[PDB]
Amino acid sequence: QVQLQESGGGLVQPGGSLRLSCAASGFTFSNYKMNWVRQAPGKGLEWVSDISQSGASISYTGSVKGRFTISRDNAKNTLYLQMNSLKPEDTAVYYCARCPAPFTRDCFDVTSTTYAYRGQGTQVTV
Amino acid sequence: LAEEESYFSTVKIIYTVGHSISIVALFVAITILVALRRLHCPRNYVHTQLFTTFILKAGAVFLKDAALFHSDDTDHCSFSTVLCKVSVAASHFATMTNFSWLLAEAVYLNCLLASTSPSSRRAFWWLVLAGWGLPVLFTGTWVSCKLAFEDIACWDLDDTSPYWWIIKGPIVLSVGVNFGLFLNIIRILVRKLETQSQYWRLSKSTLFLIPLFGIHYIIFNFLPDNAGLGIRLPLELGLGSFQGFIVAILYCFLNQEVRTEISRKWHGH
Amino acid sequence: TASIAQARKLVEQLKMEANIDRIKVSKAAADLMAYCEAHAKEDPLLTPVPASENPFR
Amino acid sequence: TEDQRNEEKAQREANKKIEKQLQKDKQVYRATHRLLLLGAGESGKNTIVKQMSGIFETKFQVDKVNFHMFDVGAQRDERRKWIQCFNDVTAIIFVVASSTNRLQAALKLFDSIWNNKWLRDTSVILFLNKQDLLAEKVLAKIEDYFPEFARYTTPEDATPEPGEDPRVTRAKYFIRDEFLRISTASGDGRHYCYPHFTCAVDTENIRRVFNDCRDIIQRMHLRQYELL
Amino acid sequence: ELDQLRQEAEQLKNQIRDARKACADATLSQITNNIDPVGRIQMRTRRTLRGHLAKIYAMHWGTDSRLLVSASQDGKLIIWDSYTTNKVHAIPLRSSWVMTCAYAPSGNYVACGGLDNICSIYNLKTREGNVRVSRELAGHTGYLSCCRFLDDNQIVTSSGDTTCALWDIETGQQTTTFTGHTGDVMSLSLAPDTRLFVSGACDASAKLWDVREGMCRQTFTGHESDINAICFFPNGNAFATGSDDATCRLFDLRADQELMTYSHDNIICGITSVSFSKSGRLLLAGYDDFNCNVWDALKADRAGVLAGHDNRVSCLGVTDDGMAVATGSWDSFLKIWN
Amino acid sequence: YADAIFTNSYRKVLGQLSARKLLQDIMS
Ligand SMILES: CC(C)CCC[C@@H](C)[C@H]1CC[C@H]2[C@@H]3CC=C4C[C@@H](O)CC[C@]4(C)[C@H]3CC[C@]12C
Ligand SMILES: CCCCCCCCCCCCCCCC(=O)O
Ligand SMILES: CCCCCCCCCCCCCCCC(=O)O
């Protein structure tokens, strides 16, 4: 069974830093592109960052580029997000999402409701 | 005169070699394009008919120089035979079919780009009918105006002001309009490429269109039938003998949409 | 939150399962093999029929 | 025998009637342009429609050419399964409302459609919508997201509308170049993108769709000849 | 009080996993180890059915093992005579986007559906001699993905709205709804007794449903990606699934777990369709790489290959008496192998 | 269309040579 488990919680003062982690289980972690997704209070799910299979291609959304760092450990089946210089608009539940299929370039996994290969989230309060 | 008769013998053997290589390559290409079921485009039909016109040209010139140039048992000053007449008419008809189908290649591509929707296919059937009917019509009216007026010396003389344009006019007009169609295609193609590269693609496409349309005929197309023979005879008979070979290579043996399928059915076993 | 209704349904379903009586895997494997072996001759793809009684030739 | 021969020949005549009708339908099928009108939530594609159930169909003619436009309704937010039904349309019309961060969602969706393995031969006619709405965008919010908009100089190449403030021009060309940065990183030459600036009220949208469909068909014809 | 039930579900699923592991004693590759292989299977294209204009998305054999229906994205259903290659009917549909077709076990009806969220029933007998729509089953909220007749009066449909539904044709109402999935239901398969059916979804899980009660008996995990195809073993005690992660699985029902995986390293494309032979010994599977693979369903070794399609293999069906296989593709051709 | 031109020139030189040979041999 595919399951994703995130870890990392608030609350951190503005300007602080915390490191989110996700333990993957039930699939070949090395074949999939991984994403981070968040849901601000009273808004929809929005895409934060994503990393490719090997770790070469990396992409961030606009308002986190420079502060956040994504990285993966293919041996330990783990995904990390290093959040630095946190602002009060970063308060959101952060989910780790998986690309629906392996060896692919595209992904359709920001579905604001009922996407299957997404974690259950971890709250971050700044 | 021995010097120039030997020179003509040498160019004769060189274009016989060229037409033989063309014949074998074109037979291979037509077999490939007709056997494989997936390759039945309305464009591959035009290519196949062009190939067959090249083969007709080669065969007609082979039988013509086999029926006119024997071992010397002919006075050859007053030489006449019904075989002469039918052979010369056959060579004329085959060459007119070749020119009409180069023009049909050009007209089809222009038709493809000048239309709005993939419609209609009236163009293709109009084309296939005209490209085989106009050569027949003009060669037939030529044979008629020969039987009615002039029956001299195996029907070779060209100095007759009339009755030679019945064949030399359609050919000149076809080459003249084929050059304009070539220019229109290259304009359309350069407006699709919008700098270090994109010149190699344009030049490759131009040098690929050169054999398919027979643009190498535009140089001597308007000349008084002389003073080019030092350079035009090797160009249009020596190098122009390989034209079927070059077209078969460029449009059958290249062109991945056939190489992938022949590799598929070869690697299937 | 009214979103906990689906968690209620999920836990009720997961509790309605686990009531199943499961046989050993060896027995199910043996049953599949026995079925495949009792019907080997009537499979026209595992053992093709002569071209005399093949309706597709 | 008699009954076997009668049954076989009746089967043959029915097959001939069916193949005649199929020949008649093939011409109508080959002479039509099928378009997939796709969009996002904020992006109002109904204004693109008013100028032209699980799916809606809209037939319209341009210069005797037939177009057949389809817009999906009552389909969930997961498109990865049913988007494969649209790999043989002539173009996907992608309506996006330039102004949650809806533009980054549009960019991610365009990336997914571009880099899909079944949609890598389908062209995309991109409509960057609501350029007039950017005129009343005077307060200084396109800087919260996309922080690379500060060090961006408008392309002197392109020419804007006569009498437009430079803010809207720079913003709309920045967003057009975002979409073009996505569509250029491919390096393929097998499917092409057509970015246009549209608004709620226009007249040239149908003519634009027609011209880009012509260009798509011409590039397909030129690739069948290996001139492109 | 949400984490309460989340944690309780965690303990329940861990208990189920422990029970599953306890019931396992020996792998299927240890009991079918001394058995003898099937050798090399070699099939040849016997027929090639031409006439569809667009890509073929689905086909279905009749119970007489002679006629078959086929659905294309041009808006046509064509009923074929497979012995003579003649077309029998050609039904123009109201909506062009069709993703499923079914053939009634009596040969009297045909059903189809797709992106218009409707299942349309087509009377084929129609003594007037005119194939016309006899019913339109509306009520689904997403596209129709699969449909199968139980009788000439009941039909089970899966949908991209994450639900299946049992319909009453002559009345037009859905008499049961099967709600357990969290993704698009992509396929379904009826048991030989038609008291159960199995269905795979885009959540990487398959479920076993009781038709007359209306509940989920069991749930089967083990795949990593979307399940595109699902088929029952000939005796109704196991079923095979095909997924986007390029593997198949065997999933015994009474052992309540997975028995065998049919994978291969240079296969990195998804499975579009699966089917068993009449004896259940071979497992045929259509792939995205334009080919089909014949699998030894007991040894997990590959026995043959059905090459000959030029585009994606979309559908695949073994006939009722086991005498031929039919494959459709996105190249718009149907082929019949033997 | 220089093949007819080649045929004409070659037939003309052949007829010239043939007449030359014929007359010179019948007079010599
Ligand atoms: C000296 C005479 C025999 C030469 C005339 C040859 C003509 C009649 C033959 C030779 C090549 C043949 C063509 C070969 C290819 C095609 C394309 C096909 O889609 C329709 C038939 C068609 C158009 C054939 C028509 C007849 C054809 C044109
Ligand atoms: C030397 C003889 C030359 C004969 C010319 C043969 C090629 C002529 C082709 C003209 C066909 C024009 C068809 C119109 C196409 C259309 O719009 O339907
Ligand atoms: C000597 C004969 C000259 C004939 C030239 C014919 C020119 C026809 C031009 C047709 C235009 C083709 C359509 C181009 C459309 C486009 O590129 O956007």
Give the domain ranges of chain D.
32-224
Q: For residues B116 and B119, give the distance between their C-alpha atoms in angstroms, rounded to a whole number.
A: 8
Q: For residues A23 and A119, give the distance between their C-alpha atoms in angstroms, rounded to a whole number.
A: 10
**Positive or negative: CA dihedral B233, B239, B245, B248:** negative
- D31:B116 CB<8 A: no
What amino acid occupies position A93?
V
CA of F4 from ligand 2 middle (Å) equals: 25
D123-129 vs D193-197, strand pairing mode: parallel
* Rounded alpha-carbon distances, angstroms, from residue D116 to A108, B39, D124, D186, E186: 10, 27, 13, 11, 19
Please report the atom of ligand 3 found closest to the CA of residue B179. Answer: 1
> Residue E289 is part of which domain span?
1-337
- Closest of A103, D109, F19, E136 to residue B1, by C-alpha: F19
Q: With H, G, I as helix, E, B as strand and everything else as coil, classify residue E295.
A: strand
CA of D226 from ligand 1 middle (Å) equals: 26
Please report the atom of ligand 2 found closest to the CA of residue B103. Answer: 7
Q: For residues E261 and E258, give the distance between their C-alpha atoms in angstroms, rounded to a whole number.
A: 8
D32-39 vs D65-72, strand pairing mode: parallel
Max CA pair span of chain E: 66
| Radius of gyration in angstroms for the set of CA atoms belonging to chain E, rounded to a whole number | 20
Q: For residues E248 and E239, give the distance between their C-alpha atoms in angstroms, rounded to a whole number.
A: 10
* Rounded alpha-carbon distances, angstroms, from residue D210 to A101, B110, D57, D218, E148: 36, 19, 18, 12, 42
* Rounded alpha-carbon distances, angstroms, from residue B117 to B44, B224, D62, D64, D126: 20, 44, 11, 9, 21
Determination technique used: cryo-EM
E334-337 vs E248-249, strand pairing mode: unpaired
- Closest of B155, B185, B184 to residue B83, by C-alpha: B155
Q: Kindly state the tokens that stand for A65.
A: 């580029």
Contact D55, E142 (CB under 8 A): no
Contact B52, B131 (CB under 8 A): no
In sequence order, the 6+-apart residues with CB closer than 8 A to the CB of D108 are A47, A110
| Pocket perturbation via mutation, ligand 3, pick of D210, D213, D214, D217 by most ligand atoms within 8 A of CB | D214
CATH number, position E276: 2.130.10.10
Query: How many structural domains compose chain C?
Result: 1
- E310:B268 CB<8 A: no
Chains that contact F by 3+ CB pairs under 8 Å? B
Read out DSSP for A31-66? GS-EEEEEE-TTS-EEEEEEE-SSS--EEE-GGGTT
* Rounded alpha-carbon distances, angstroms, from residue B219 to B170, B215, D222, E267, E336: 17, 8, 27, 57, 57
Q: How far is B228 from chain F (nearest CA, A)?
A: 10
> Residue A76 is part of which domain span?
3-124
Of the listed ligands, the closest to the CA of B131 is 2
Q: For residues B267 and D79, give the distance between their C-alpha atoms in angstroms, rounded to a whole number.
A: 37
Contact D171, D149 (CB under 8 A): yes
E strand or H helix at E44: none
D202 close contact with A: CB closer than 8 A: no
E224 close contact with A: CB closer than 8 A: yes
Our CA dihedral for D105, D108, D114, D115, rounded to 10 degrees, sits at -150
Please compute, for residue A33, the number of CA atoms within 13 A of its CA located in the half-sphere on the CB side: 20
Q: For residues E186 and E207, give the distance between their C-alpha atoms in angstroms, rounded to a whole number.
A: 12
Q: Kindly state the tokens that stand for D165.
A: 């403030």
In terms of DSSP H, where are the helices of chain D? Answer: 3-30, 46-49, 102-114, 166-184, 205-224
Of the listed ligands, the closest to the CA of B187 is 3
**Positive or negative: CA dihedral B120, B122, B125, B130:** negative
Instruction: Please name the residues between 79 and 108 in chain E that touch chain C, using a CB distance below 8 Å.
Output: 82-83
Q: For residues E325 and E336, give the distance between their C-alpha atoms in angstroms, rounded to a whole number.
A: 6
Length of chain B: 269
Q: Which residues of D touch A63 (CB under 8 A)?
A: 101, 144-145, 147
Resolution of this model in Å is 2.6
Query: How many structural domains compose chain E?
Result: 1
The answer to whether E and F touch (≥3 CB pairs < 8 Å) is no
E164-168: strand order across its sheet = E144-149, E154-159, E164-168, E174-178
Question: Taking phi first (over 0 means left), then psi (-120 to 50 degrees means alpha), and beta for anything else, what does residue E75 get?
Answer: left
| Radius of gyration in angstroms for the set of CA atoms belonging to chain D, rounded to a whole number | 22
Query: Measured at the alpha carbon of residue C35, what is the angle toward residues C29 and C36, in degrees to the nearest 5?
Result: 90
Contact A3, A74 (CB under 8 A): no
E313-318: strand order across its sheet = E45-49, E334-337, E325-329, E313-318
Q: Kindly state the tokens that stand for E68.
A: 């078959």
Q: For residues A89 and A48, give the distance between their C-alpha atoms in angstroms, rounded to a whole number.
A: 13
Regarding the beta carbon of B52 and ligand 1, being less than 6 Å apart is answered yes
Across the interface, of E6, E162, E204, the residue whose CB is closest to A2 is: E204
What amino acid occupies position A69?
T
Across the interface, of B112, B116, B208, the residue whose CB is closest to D65 is: B116
In sequence order, the 6+-apart residues with CB closer than 8 A to the CB of A72 are A29, A34, A51, A55, A78, A79, A80
E strand or H helix at E68: strand E67-72
Q: For residues E287 and B20, give the distance between their C-alpha atoms in angstroms, rounded to a whole number.
A: 47
The answer to whether B and D touch (≥3 CB pairs < 8 Å) is yes
**Positive or negative: CA dihedral C1, C7, C9, C12:** negative
Q: For residues E327 and E324, give the distance between their C-alpha atoms in angstroms, rounded to a whole number.
A: 10
CATH number of D32-224: 3.40.50.300
Q: For residues B119 and E187, give the distance between their C-alpha atoms in angstroms, rounded to a whole number.
A: 39
Q: How far is D147 from chain A (nearest CA, A)?
A: 6
Q: Kindly state the tokens that stand for D87.
A: 């790999």
Q: Which residues of E touch D57 (CB under 8 A)?
A: 95
DSSP designation for E75: T
Residue where the block lists tokens 């056959």: B90
E119-123 vs E109-114, strand pairing mode: antiparallel
CA of E31 from ligand 3 middle (Å) equals: 73
| Pocket perturbation via mutation, ligand 1, pick of B34, B39, B49, B93 by most ligand atoms within 8 A of CB | B49
Query: How many structural domains compose chain A?
Result: 1
* Rounded alpha-carbon distances, angstroms, from residue A54 to A31, A65, A73, A75: 9, 21, 9, 11
Question: Taking phi first (over 0 means left), then psi (-120 to 50 degrees means alpha), and beta for anything else, what does residue B201 get?
Answer: alpha
Query: Measured at the alpha carbon of residue E101, what is the angle toward residues E96 and E106, in degrees to the nearest 5?
Result: 140
DSSP designation for B147: H
Contact E239, E233 (CB under 8 A): yes
